[PDB]
Design a protein around this ligand. Structure first.
Ligand code: NAP
Ligand code: NAP
Lengths: 256, 255
């Protein structure tokens, strides 16, 4: 159980981040979710968490902004208690499709602020209370695009790979505090549609082709990702740290 | 033989970058190097290239400034010809020793702008002509801190890891034009002192512990890295792309 633990899932307002929040809630956690451009969708997830019988808080955070992150975490600490479980799920530039030389510097810059500096801000905010409490779980969200590359996705491949480096440094700083830090290296996820997964911003016939590159010949359910995350977030995962764990249904193997 | 090739070594003003530029020249390349804080050191490096009887050009570039980068590449093209070989060797935050919670946003943001946006801006400027000339070599400089972490180095480990992701995407986009893109994953390097390596910014007690955790029980000579970089830059390395090649004397093994 994650009973008596408080979770912050950045990008909790919808997609996979929402299923992360509900999964952490179902397993006993009280959960905060962020919203940026969807603070209303965040509040609605918080009400789904409350309907499960847990405490919840929707806060409005652009994770690139250290003032909004710090204010948000301090708000969680007052209302729920210090963050025990951090999920850096918020991402920009998930489905860009532009060669590097046609990629706009301001798109690159935003992707790096959200995907890297977002994780840096949130980790900096929560880790002092995790150390003080001698317990912590930080889960960073990477992609096989980060470990295998992706044509037309220079910022996403850079930021998702960068998060593995960040994971390993933070695993080192946190180790002697029972703070683990791990990266989930995601394949592709389905669910009901765009509300559940950014995969649906990819043209259906390109998705069918990516699915045929998975050994399981199907995109993952959001739950198949959230359940790995929930195990890593448990006390029982105390000797797993600094790993890049692939949740990709064989997308990263030599599939025919 | 790199005869009839134009190389750009970012941070060729000193350290390993200087030896990179010098080694590529010895191998026959016309070599542009950058300076930012040390344009005079960069002009000095260009003159050492000329002593080898090659063409050179110091250019004053902050690789984070795309304007500065675009002009610099424009300037190289006119004087030397289109860049065939890009070495993204310029780095900020190389020897931070600050836990993440005590690390300042401004130091983080600068490290990211230089180590990631630098590589982006330079690749952005040179790749159109590499594609036009149907040939190209991009060498990104990573670090075992990127693949194994390092306490108090959140920006360095983040950026050095991110350069491997960037390598793989550029390898996929460049492959059909005989443009390879590869990362060198460095251990630690000695040489003459602070002149040849930013290893010497690390306190001597810490350097001895790091050295004893290399299987070869010694830092690398800068040349031992530059020679791997030179081979990847050759026509013969044409089937090697998107790899993270470790040059680190067993620092990444269970020593
Ligand atoms: N779906 C997949 O198959 C897949 C595959 C590989 C990796 N991933 C990773 O999984 C994570 C979630 O992807 P997804 O499909 O759920 O994406 P999504 O449906 O597009 O949701 C993106 C989420 O990020 C939030 N967000 C974006 N920019 C933000 C910012 N600056 N500050 C704070 N929150 C911000 C959004 O909140 P608002 O809407 O309120 O702005 C939203 O909750 C990402 O890290 C992604 O890289 C997804
Ligand atoms: N030395 C090692 O043992 C070691 C270990 C692992 C990795 N590395 C990697 O090897 C590379 C070179 O290291 P080094 O020892 O030569 O470092 P160094 O001695 O500190 O040299 C740093 C270089 O970066 C340049 N630079 C910094 N910021 C710049 C910017 N914004 N725009 C343009 N140029 C900029 C400097 O130019 P100015 O002097 O003109 O300001 C200088 O030439 C780096 O990528 C580093 O991460 C080195």
């Amino acid at each position: 159980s994650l009973q008596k633990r408080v979770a912050l899932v950045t990008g909790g307002s919808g997609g996979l981040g929402r299923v992360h929040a509900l999964t952490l809630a179902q397993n006993g956690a009280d959960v905060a979710v962020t919203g940026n451009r969807n603070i209303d969708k965040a509040e609605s997830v918080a009400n789904e968490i409350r309907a499960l019988g847990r405490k919840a808080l929707a806060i409005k955070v652009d994770v690139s902004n250290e003032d909004e992150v710090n204010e948000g975490v301090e708000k969680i600490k007052k209302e729920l208690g210090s963050v025990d479980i951090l999920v850096n799920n918020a991402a920009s530039g998930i489905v860009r499709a532009t060669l590097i030389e046609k990629t706009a510097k301001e798109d690159w810059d935003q992707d790096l602020r959200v995907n890297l500096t977002g994780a840096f801000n949130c980790i900096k905010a929560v880790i002092p209370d995790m150390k003080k409490n001698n317990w912590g779980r930080i889960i960073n969200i990477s992609s096989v695009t980060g470990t295998m590359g992706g044509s037309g996705q220079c910022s996403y491949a850079t930021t998702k790979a960068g998060l593995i480096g960040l994971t390993k440094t933070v695993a080192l700083e946190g180790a002697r505090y029972n703070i683990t830090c791990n990266a989930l290296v995601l394949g592709v996820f389905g669910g009901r549609g765009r509300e559940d997964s950014s995969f649906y911003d990819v043209a259906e016939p390109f998705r069918e082709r990516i699915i045929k590159r998975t050994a399981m010949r199907r995109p993952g359910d959001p739950k198949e990702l959230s359940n790995v995350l929930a195990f890593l977030a448990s006390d029982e995962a105390s000797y797993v740290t600094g790993d890049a764990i692939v949740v990709g249904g064989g997308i990263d193997l030599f599939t025919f």
